Design a protein around this nucleic acid. Structure first.
Lengths: 95, 83, 97, 109, 97, 83, 109, 95, 109, 95
DNA sequence: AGGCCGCTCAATTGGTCGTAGACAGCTCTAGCACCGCTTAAACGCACGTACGCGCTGTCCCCCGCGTTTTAACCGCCAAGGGGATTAC
DNA sequence: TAATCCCCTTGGCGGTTAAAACGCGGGGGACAGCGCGTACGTGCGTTTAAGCGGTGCTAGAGCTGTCTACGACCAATTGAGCGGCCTC
C-alpha cells in the first residue's frame, strides 16, 4: 500500500447526504472543497493566533474562534455560524 | 449625548484639502457626499473590527493598537502608533 | 481692479501647498465626535484614546488620498480633470469593493 | 473497564472530525493550548459553511438538470453569494469558468 | 450569398460561450514549453509535473480574466468598447502593481 | 537543448478567446503583445517563488503543491490542487 | 569559574539583539524549535534594511537642511525607492504626506 | 510604579550614528521605525513558519529564513541581504 | 596554559591577512611604530576594493558567457569605471587589450 | 629543496567566492590582482609615511590611513571605505 | 525636545544536558522525459465589411475663486471619575 | 477575578480668529453630433505543430534504517538596555 493521507471526502459526503441525499459529487469538486476547508481552517486558525497574541493569551478558546468568525465571516453568515457553533458547544458541553 | 450629523463634521473644505493632498485639481459637486459615504463605510469596517477587539479584550476604551490590527486586517497597515 | 488669478492657479497652489504639508486636513473635534457617533451605534458608551482618534484620522486621510490617486489616474484615463464619483466607484470596484 | 469510546463529532451531533481539527490546531502553531470549545466551535462553523455551499451546489446542479456536483456549479453558487463572494474574493476555482457577466453597454439595442 | 455575421456578433457569442464554458483556452504543450524555457532561465534542466503545469495554467487564465474584467471596467469608464494597453497598465497600477 | 521562444505559444486566438471569457468585445492589435508581456512578468514572479520553494525542497522535479504555496503567497489562491 | 559575558549580537558584530529576536521568534509560535542560523540571519537582514533606510533618511534630511529625521523624510525615503515601494505598497506612514507628484496634464500650457 | 515597554530605540540610534554621526532623530520617526521592524519581522517570520510547514520542518533554520528572504524581499535587496547574511553567519560560526 | 588564538583577520572577520599587512607595513620603512587601527583599516579598504572589482570581473565574465575571469574582463572593468580609472590612469595591464572605442568620425556615414 | 614565495592567493579567492561563488580564476589575472594589491598597498603606505612626517607623528594609526583614503581615492568608494573601516574598527574593538 | 546621562531591571546567554529532527544514504518504482505515429484541431493570413476612437467647434454649465461673516474651533483652565492596569 | 489608583480620559467654560460658510462674476470642463481617417472582428481555406494514443526508461520522487549534529531549557550572572530628566 501507500501512506494514508487525510482528506475531507467522507465528512463532505456525510454533510452532502444531510443536505442533498439524491445527488452525486465529482472528485474535482471534492478536492476543491478540501482546499476550501483547509484554507478557511488556516485563515481562522491564524486569526485566532493573532488575537491570542493581541490579548496575550496562551490558549485559544471558542471565545477567540467566535471573535475570528465575527471578524472574517460577514453578517448573517457570521451570526448563524454563531448560532450553530453555540448550539453545538451546548450539545457537546452536555455531551 | 447622542450624536446625529457629525459626518458633516468632516467639512467640505477638509475634503478639498484632502483632494489637494491627493493631487485633484477640479472637484465635482457630487464628490463630497460620495467621499463621506465611502469614508463612513471604511470607518465602520475598521471600528467594527476595533469594537470586536475591545469587547474580546473586555475593555471599554478604544485603543490605537486595535486600530493598528484592524487596518492590518484590511491590508492598510499603518506605521507610527506603537506598532 | 483687485488681483484675480485664473481658475486652477490657486488650485495648483493648493496642490503644491498640501503635498509639501504633512499636517492633518481634518478638524480634530468633529472627527472625534463622528467616530464616537458611529461607534455608539455599534457599542454604547465607547471611549476613545485621542491618539487612537488621531490614528483613525491619519489612516482615513491617507486612505482617501490613495483613493484619489486612483481616482485621478482614472480621470486622466477618462480624459477629465473634474473628477466625478463614478471615478471613485471605478477605483473601488476594480480594487474589489 | 473503559466505557464506549464515543466520537466527539457525534457528541457535538456533527460530522466534521473534532479529533482532526484539534490535532491540527495543536500541530499548526497557533497556541500550544486550544480551548475545549474552540475546535468544536470551529468545526461547527466549517460544517455550517460546508452544508450551505453543498446545498447551493446541489440546487445549482438541479438548475442545470445535473445530479453530480461540478466545479462549474461551485463557481455559479459561491460567486453568486455576495458574502461568500467577499469571503472568497481572491480565490480561484480550477475549471470553474466564470460567472456569466455581460455588461449592459456591451449588449445591443 | 454566403452567410456573414456583423462585427461583435461572433464576439458576443464567444463571450456567452466561454462564460458558459469552463475549459482552458490556451494550448497546453506550448504553455508547458514556455514553463520549461522560463524555468531554465532560473534553473536549468528542471522537470515539471503535468499537474503543476495545469495548476499554473488555470492560475494564468484566471489572473488574465481578472485583468480583462478590470480592463473592461476601465474601457467603459473611458466610454469605450475597444481596449487599448493604457487600460491594462492603468488597471495594473490600480491593483498596486 | 534550450528553448528561445514559447511565449508565442500563448497564441493570439487564445488571448482572443480569454478576452471573450474576460468579456472584451473588441481587442486592439496592440493588446496581445503587452498582455503577453504582463503575463510573462506574472509567470516569472510565480515561477521564481516556485523555484525558490523547489530548491528549498531539495527537489529537481517541480510539483503543483509549491505552485499552490506561491500563488497563495501572491494573493491568488487557487482551489483544486492543494494536497 | 564562569565564562565572560560576550553577547551573540557582538558575535555577529551587529547592533540588533540576537537574544531578543530569537525569543520573539520562539514566542511568536512559528516553530517550537528554530535553527541557529535563522535569528542571526534575520537580524543581519533587518539591520541591513534599516541601514539603507538610515542613509535614505540621512540624505533626505541633508537635502532639507535639517540634521534631524522627520517622517516627511521617511515618506520621501520610502516612496522614492522601487524595491522599498514593492516592500511597502500597502503601508501607511504617520504624518508623511505624499510624494511631490503632479500629473503633466495639471500644468499650464 | 511603572512597567517596562521594550522598543528598538537604542539599536536604531546606534546604526544611525554608525552611518550618520551628525544626523538627528525625532521620536515619531522612531515610532515608524519600530512599526517597520515589527511589521517586517512578522512578515518574514510568518513566511518562515509557512516554509517550515510546507517542507514538514519542525525547525526554522538559516535555509528557511533565507528562503523567506528570496520570497518576500524583492531583487537587489535580497541578494545584498544574502551577502551580509552569509558573511554574518560565517563570522558567527567563527565566533 | 594558553588562550586559543584567533587571527586578527578573524577578529575583524575580514579575509585579508591582518598579520601580513601589519608586518609588511612595519618592515616597509614608513614608520617604526604603527597604530592598531591602521593595518586593519587598510586591510578593510583593500578587501572592499578587491571585492568590488571582483564583482565587476564576475558579472563582466557572465556577460561574455565565460565562467572564469580573464584580464580582458579586468580591462573592461577598470576602463569602464570612472573612479577606478582615476585610481589607475597610468597603470598598464598585461594582456588586457583596450576598450572597444571607435571615434564618431571613424564610423561610416 | 625550494623556498616559499608568498602571494595574496587564497584571500582574493575567498572574497571572489564570496561575491561570485561560481566564477573561476585565470592565474595571470591573479598575478594582476597581486600586483594591484601591492601597488595600492605601497601607495597608501607611502601616503601614511608622508602624513606621519608632516604631522611629526612617529606612529601611524587609523586616522592617517583614513586621511590617505580621503586623499587618493576620490569620493564615493572612499566614503564607502570609511564606512566598512569604521564598522571594522568598531567590531575589532568589540572583539 | 534630543539626547544625554545617571538609575534600575529583566534579559541574555554559557555549560551542560537529554532528546528528537532531519540530513545523508539508498533502493525502487512510477511517472517525467524521450521517441516515433497518425489526425484533424490549430493557425494564421490575406481579404474585403462594417465599426471604433477620440477630436473641431460649440454649448451649456459647473465649480474655483475671492473676499465677508460667523459661530464654533482652538488653545487654555479647572473638575470628575472610569477604567486600565497591575500585583495577588 | 476582587481592587484600585492614578492617570488618562470626558464633560464644562471664558475668548479666537481659523475655519467654516456664502453668494458672484467667470473662466474652464465635459462632452455629444457628426464627419473622418481607420483599426480590427470575421468567412474561411491551410499548415503544422498540437492533440491522441503508444512505448522503452531512468532521474529523481518517494520511502526507509541511521546517526549525529542541534537546538531548547534551568539556576545564574551579567552588561546592555530601558523607565527618567532636563536642558540647550
Amino acid at each position: 500500500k501507500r501512506s494514508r493521507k487525510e482528506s475531507y471526502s467522507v465528512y463532505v459526503y456525510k454533510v452532502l447526504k444531510q443536505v442533498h441525499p439524491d445527488t452525486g459529487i465529482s472528485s474535482k469538486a471534492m478536492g476543491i472543497m478540501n482546499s476550501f476547508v483547509n484554507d478557511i481552517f488556516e485563515r481562522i486558525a491564524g486569526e485566532a493566533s493573532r488575537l491570542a497574541h493581541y490579548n496575550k493569551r496562551s490558549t485559544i478558546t471558542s471565545r477567540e474562534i467566535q471573535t475570528a468568525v465575527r471578524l472574517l465571516l460577514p453578517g448573517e453568515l457570521a451570526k448563524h455560524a454563531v448560532s450553530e457553533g453555540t448550539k453545538a458547544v451546548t450539545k457537546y458541553t452536555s455531551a | 449625548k447622542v450624536l446625529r450629523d457629525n459626518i458633516q463634521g468632516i467639512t467640505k473644505p477638509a475634503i478639498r484639502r484632502l483632494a489637494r493632498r491627493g493631487g485633484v485639481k477640479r472637484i465635482s459637486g457630487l464628490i463630497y457626499e460620495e467621499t463621506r459615504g465611502v469614508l463612513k463605510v471604511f470607518l465602520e469596517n475598521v471600528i467594527r473590527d476595533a469594537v470586536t477587539y475591545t469587547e474580546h479584550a473586555k475593555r471599554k476604551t478604544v485603543t490605537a493598537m486595535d486600530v493598528v490590527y484592524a487596518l492590518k486586517r484590511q491590508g492598510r497597515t499603518l506605521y507610527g502608533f506603537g506598532g | 481692479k483687485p488681483h484675480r488669478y485664473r481658475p486652477g492657479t490657486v488650485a495648483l497652489r493648493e496642490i503644491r501647498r498640501y503635498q509639501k504639508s504633512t499636517e492633518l486636513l481634518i478638524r480634530k473635534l468633529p472627527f472625534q465626535r463622528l467616530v464616537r457617533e458611529i461607534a455608539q451605534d455599534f457599542k454604547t458608551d465607547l471611549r476613545f484614546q485621542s491618539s487612537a482618534v488621531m490614528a483613525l484620522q491619519e489612516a482615513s486621510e491617507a486612505y482617501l488620498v490613495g483613493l484619489f490617486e486612483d481616482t485621478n489616474l482614472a480621470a486622466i484615463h477618462a480624459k477629465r480633470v473634474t473628477i466625478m464619483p463614478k471615478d471613485i466607484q471605478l477605483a473601488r470596484r476594480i480594487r474589489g469593493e | 473497564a473503559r466505557a464506549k469510546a464515543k466520537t466527539r463529532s457525534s457528541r457535538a451531533g456533527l460530522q466534521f472530525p473534532v479529533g482532526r481539527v484539534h490535532r491540527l490546531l495543536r500541530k499548526g502553531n497557533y497556541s500550544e493550548r486550544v480551548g475545549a470549545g474552540a475546535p468544536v466551535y470551529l468545526a461547527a462553523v466549517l460544517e455550517y459553511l460546508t452544508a450551505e455551499i453543498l446545498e447551493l451546489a446541489g440546487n445549482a446542479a438541479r438548475d442545470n438538470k445535473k445530479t453530480r456536483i461540478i466545479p462549474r456549479h461551485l463557481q455559479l453558487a459561491i460567486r453568486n453569494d455576495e458574502e461568500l463572494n467577499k469571503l472568497l474574493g481572491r480565490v480561484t476555482i480550477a475549471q470553474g469558468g466564470v460567472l456569466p457577466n455581460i455588461q449592459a453597454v456591451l449588449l445591443p439595442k
